[PDB]
A paper describes a structure:
tyTy H5 is the prototype of clade 2.2 viruses that are now established in Egypt. Interestingly, when Δ133 and Ile155Thr were introduced simultaneously into tyTy H5, a small increase in avian receptor binding (~3-fold) and a significant increase of human receptor binding (~100-fold) were observed. Firstly, the protrusion at residue 133 in the 130-loop is lost as a result of the deletion. Secondly, because of the Ile155Thr substitution, the hydrophobic surface, formed jointly by the side-chain of Ile-155 and the protruding Ala-133 in wild-type HA, is lost.
However, it has been established for the H1 (1918), H2 (1957) and H3 (1968) pandemic viruses that a change in the binding specificity of the virus membrane glycoprotein, Haemagglutinin (HA), of avian viruses from a preference for α-2,3-linked sialo-saccharides (avian receptor) to a preference for α-2,6-linked sialo-saccharides (human receptor) is a prerequisite for efficient transmission of avian viruses to humans. We have carried out structural studies on the HAs of a number of H5 mutants that were isolated from infected humans in Vietnam and Egypt to explain differences in their receptor binding properties. None of the substituted residues in the mutants we have characterised make direct interactions with the receptors; they appear to have their effects by perturbing the biochemical properties of the receptor binding pocket.
Residue numbers in the entry:
A (entry chain B), D (entry chain D), F (entry chain F): 1 to 163
B (entry chain A), C (entry chain C), E (entry chain E): -1 to 320
The structure:
């Protein structure tokens, strides 16, 4: 979307990552596997859960229509009353439909941002120690075991050790 | 051949779609519907309290005591009231109810009446207090409203009436009374000796003096006469004073307002559903944790907010790739 | 001189500006105006249907048949009605029209009347049905409203009137009638023999009994008398019953409501424009594909939505660099 | 703007690119020339056209005022009626003026995003085969003919072939 | 060891928090409160102009001249009017004020009256123009409203009244008058010789004919009689015509409308505060440069816009890091 | 936030930079020190000041309630009048509370964007002349005196001179 990661330079999503929303796919001599990044996954759950509740709570104090009756010589205020209740219903229907459209868009771009920030978190740790293929992957120059992959996910990758 | 690590994101078998400003039908991994679109099609109890279903009677017919509405002679407390669009049993004897819509607005803040006697038939010594009409049949025999009395002359005489009721109850009191408008001077004297008559009514705030209008009118329920009814709220310790020399449809019963609270008069053809609900509409009841619904704008109870939308769905997950 | 490829974006000679929250007058390559700001200054036909332009007449003056409004004695169907702010030709003979605003609200849902005779002048044998006044001049000679009759005594007598009209048409029927309020008892007896008079009117739903108010009043159109007019809708198969012994401005003509639909009464000083439009306002007509406009809030037809904005412009292109 | 491309590291726009909204300027032995990127140009046209229509369609069910009349003893409800109609007109005027201001801002940043995503689409294809000048251009180490430039625009640039 | 340059941003000791959609209590470096939440608790002058504080009097009691309201016999111009919820001194002699709420709506557009005499007591030759009652005591002795006169019979006679006032002022004129409703026919003849009476009132737009309603009513202020009052605006060069043969509470004083503008009737128990303000509410005055406030929805003056929010705070700075 | 700079790859803010909102921390043989970037700081002040005023000015034409009175047989229109005034107050309260929530979010991401655009302004000037540590800093290969640091802040860093 706006940040170019989801359906961008990362061509598609992973069926195999059932663990969270964003994460890694490693492969080395030991074996390959998926592992969700629990930090940015949890960050997003919180952000999105709050958005949802904020949308529900903002619409609490809303217009509520009421039955009123009028006789056949009160047609002007009958009509006035109708116009006023439709009026408020139409304002609130618009406020709901638009809020959803606007925040849906923000939510999708928010996920796009989180994926891009994760790619850049890895990119800034590796630097010369890995080749940026550009499809979402990094080709290691040195060998990287399961201890070494764990450090990348931790955010504790020692660059001076491997160069 | 060399080791590598990739960055990616979730995908799944979801086909749930949402909309944005620039893009429609966007498939996502997770979405949340926030709009309730279904109802049970029934009129239920509102949180354990049964509604008042008037069936074929109107609020007027109920309160005045049309004989067809004998079902509602002493109704228990209610949560809401349900009236049909055009109830069959209204004012059996034709004529209007004065300030009817304002009376109905009062019912919206009332949950229970307690009907009581304020002027017994037995106290009408000098007048015949047993007037009836074939416009109000009860089992083929002519009859009349239960809660008001049609006074007529006795012994070719209609002496001036002078009656007071003092509201010695603690509750506000709904009092109803009426005036009869006859066809011609013949019927005027035949029912009430006096040819020129009046009804005066007075409380601490009311100051009324009604005069009958004698005129030829189109037959309604086989009657060219009309009856016009009035009402008032009589405060505790206040008293109502009636004076009349003819045409007086006097009160027999009044209503103590014993319980006030949230209520409403729904117009609905539906009958009682034998269910319970937290939220009710005129076309059905809603059981839902959704924050919005689109069933009907008029609701009572703990309800979701009404919108005219056909669909409201929030994206929670990622754009889902095929 | 090695080969190279650059990434860039569009620029052009555009000076179109748009606004954002953080920034004003932002020049862009492409923009779209979405606000219509002009109108033709004319009252047009609405989708081929000409409006009813009352010119110097009022709705009252038209319907009662003020002689100055003879132009509108049988008007063809209309799309909307245009009345001036203070029309010259209202009730020529002074006095009020009862429930006038509610009658005008009915016109908003009516597109065509068909005026018919319901009580011919020739049927007034015992009364003079040719009363006129210099307050309603038609070509210098004194005259009166065309659609109602001023009945006065004949042969120093005003016998009680008893007339019925039964609506045997299929359409609803607008009936108008009136009561005359004189200056003093002298003029009362001089016009109608009887000193104490009444007018009773009855339908299936109407029950009226009017009594004239004799009093001295400021001269209006050289008259201290007043005329108060009334109206009703007479349903098919219902009948109206008049009874009176004086002061009765009786109906001659009534109006069949033959076409109902969308309409409105615009207040406007403008005259007919001889154009056609899909959207009309009181100050002019709009021909526009814009979704918004700011011409006037009161419109009729297929119109854009009205806003009070002076400018609404959407960016579609890029920020344009100088 | 927000994404730093338009009026950022790409210093200005190109008068010469009349073909579309974003694109390329090549130069080699054969000849130079402009060519719009039809993918991201078309993507933007669709996005922006939809936005416009969504803004128009959301305001469909809106308040419509109506002439009502009152006599001189109905001043309270005359006034009430006036306040209610001005009320709704003011609410809707605000809803229009604000929607435009908010979406104009998003639209300009959307273009900024598309230009940046195009720069990164090229950058990730070339890598070591070209020098990132930083003004929006890439200086080729190897020679690149019109067949070779076409591959960059296609998204079919073979990196292993030239290194 | 080697040289280096870093890019960073501001942080400080701020604990100011703001909210977004996805996140609450977000600490920022700088924020701006835009909601005024306090008031001075006083009723002040509005931009140098003192309000009219009626204290224990009502608008009716003031305008008719209840003797308890002698404080307000000629009040200077005002900015707004402050009336208590249930003022003690209303209509001392019981009864209603006709179209009272519509009169009060007029006061909202009025800043100053100038009271003048239009019918002096000395002009009542044939009637006693000195009627009083113990329901309106002024210092223990019985009295009456100051601005209207209670006419009664003189020498066992009540000849028909016929009086005109022509508004030869340049300003619109508020005229008030009344009718007395007695208990029984005994009191009717005892006060006004005639048993059957009327009051007719006429302007260019008014055409009224009041008849007293004789009836027994609950004692209010020790009185079973009622007085019903009426009002009108008399345009310049128009005249009002009174005719009556009994029960007429005639005008003595009327009010010239000399200043029109913004005003309002606040309901408040508060007393005058001896302050000045640019914005006033019924519970206090606001001095604030904030664009919003949440004090009270009814305000007068140059005021911030009212919201029901408890907190409105805009982020201006960066997210502040611990 | 959305752009990954503030509380992202730049781990925290600086107490010592009291000069502006964004800037630099240099260190060389001469001495270290903070200096705000006056261009992007001023750009942000203008943007944010305008936002604030736009929020205030948009709410100018708003609903204003008025005292009306009704007698005890005008309960339907009394109630109607009440529902209409609460109605408009609730619509406007929602419009205020929501505008603030939406623009607060945008403002924080706007700062995040400005910091990231400043990092990229430096990054694109240095290129191979400095090592991108990834914590927000650049390690110089060549020595850089106070004249040389000033050029980076100016935007007048001569890359050909030092390579
Ligand atoms: C995929 O969807 C199927 C239905 O098509 C569902 O039953 C299954 O649980 C889904 N997979 C999950 C939740 O992992
Ligand atoms: C998808 O959206 C289109 C309009 O873009 C609509 O017509 C359709 O009903 C939507 N849903 C479907 C096809 O299930
Ligand atoms: C009704 O009764 C109470 C107390 O018994 C009395 O004080 C009151 O005056 C009576 N009300 C009237 C209107 O006479
Ligand atoms: C911009 O260029 C167009 C050519 O398409 C021309 O019509 C127009 O006049 C130009 N505007 C100005 C201000 O020169
Ligand atoms: C540009 O906007 C300014 C206010 O920001 C306004 O005064 C001016 O008239 C606008 N248009 C111009 C300069 O053409
Ligand atoms: C009017 O005419 C119809 C047709 O004969 C008749 O059936 C009906 O009774 C009449 N209406 C009234 C009110 O008498
Ligand atoms: C922050 O918000 C919480 C509710 O989530 C509230 O209880 C608390 O008082 C707020 N923090 C303050 C006032 O410092
Ligand atoms: C009242 O007096 C004015 C002159 O002061 C006169 O022109 C006008 O006609 C009079 N009004 C009436 C209603 O007679």
């Amino acid at each position: 979307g706006l940040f170019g990661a989801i359906a961008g330079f990362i061509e598609g999503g992973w069926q195999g990552m059932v663990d969270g929303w964003y994460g890694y796919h490693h492969s080395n001599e030991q074996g390959s596997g998926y592992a969700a990044d629990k930090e940015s996954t949890q960050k997003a759950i919180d952000g999105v859960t709050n958005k949802v509740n904020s949308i529900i709570d903002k619409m609490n104090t809303q217009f509520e229509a009421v039955g009123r009756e009028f006789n056949n010589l009160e047609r002007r205020i009958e009509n006035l009353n109708k116009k006023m209740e439709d009026g408020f219903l139409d304002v609130w229907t618009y406020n709901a439909e638009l809020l959803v459209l606007m925040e849906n868009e923000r939510t999708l771009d928010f996920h796009d941002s989180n994926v891009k920030n994760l790619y850049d978190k890895v990119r800034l740790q590796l630097r010369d120690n890995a080749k940026e293929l550009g499809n979402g992957c990094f080709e290691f120059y040195h060998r990287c075991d399961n201890e070494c992959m764990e450090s990348v996910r931790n955010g504790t990758y020692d660059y001076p050790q491997y160069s | 051949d060399p080791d590598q690590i990739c960055i990616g994101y979730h995908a799944n078998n979801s086909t749930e779609q949402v909309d944005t400003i620039m893009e429609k039908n966007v498939t996502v991994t997770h979405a949340q519907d926030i709009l309730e679109k279904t109802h049970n099609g029934k009129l239920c109890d509102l949180d354990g309290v049964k509604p008042l279903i008037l069936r074929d009677c109107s609020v007027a017919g109920w309160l005045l005591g049309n004989p067809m509405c004998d079902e509602f002679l002493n109704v228990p407390e209610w949560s809401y009231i349900v009236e049909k669009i055009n109830p069959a049993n209204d004012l059996c004897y034709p004529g209007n109810f004065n300030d009817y819509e304002e009376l109905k607005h009062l019912l919206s803040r009332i949950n229970h009446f307690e009907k009581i006697q304020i002027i017994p038939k037995s106290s009408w010594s000098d007048h015949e207090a047993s007037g009836v009409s074939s416009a109000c049949p009860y089992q083929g025999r002519s009859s009349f409203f239960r809660n008001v009395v049609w006074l007529t002359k006795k012994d070719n005489a209609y002496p001036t009436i002078k009656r007071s009721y003092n509201n010695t109850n603690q509750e506000d009191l709904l009092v109803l009374w009426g005036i009869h408008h006859p066809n011609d001077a013949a019927e005027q004297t035949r029912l009430y000796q006096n040819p020129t008559t009046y009804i005066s009514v007075g409380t601490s705030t009311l100051n009324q003096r009604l005069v009958p209008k004698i005129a030829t009118r189109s037959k309604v329920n086989g009657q060219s006469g009309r009856m016009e009814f009035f009402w008032t709220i009589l405060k505790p310790n206040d008293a109502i004073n009636f004076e009349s020399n003819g045409n007086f449809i006097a009160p027999e019963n009044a209503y103590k307002i014993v319980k006030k609270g949230d209520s409403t008069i729904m117009k609905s053809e539906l009958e009682y559903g034998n269910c319970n609900t937290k939220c009710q509409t005129p076309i059905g009841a809603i059981n839902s944790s959704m924050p919005f619904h689109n069933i009907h704008p008029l609701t009572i109870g703990e309800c979701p907010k009404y919108v005219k939308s056909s669909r409201l769905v929030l994206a929670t997950g990622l754009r889902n790739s095929p």
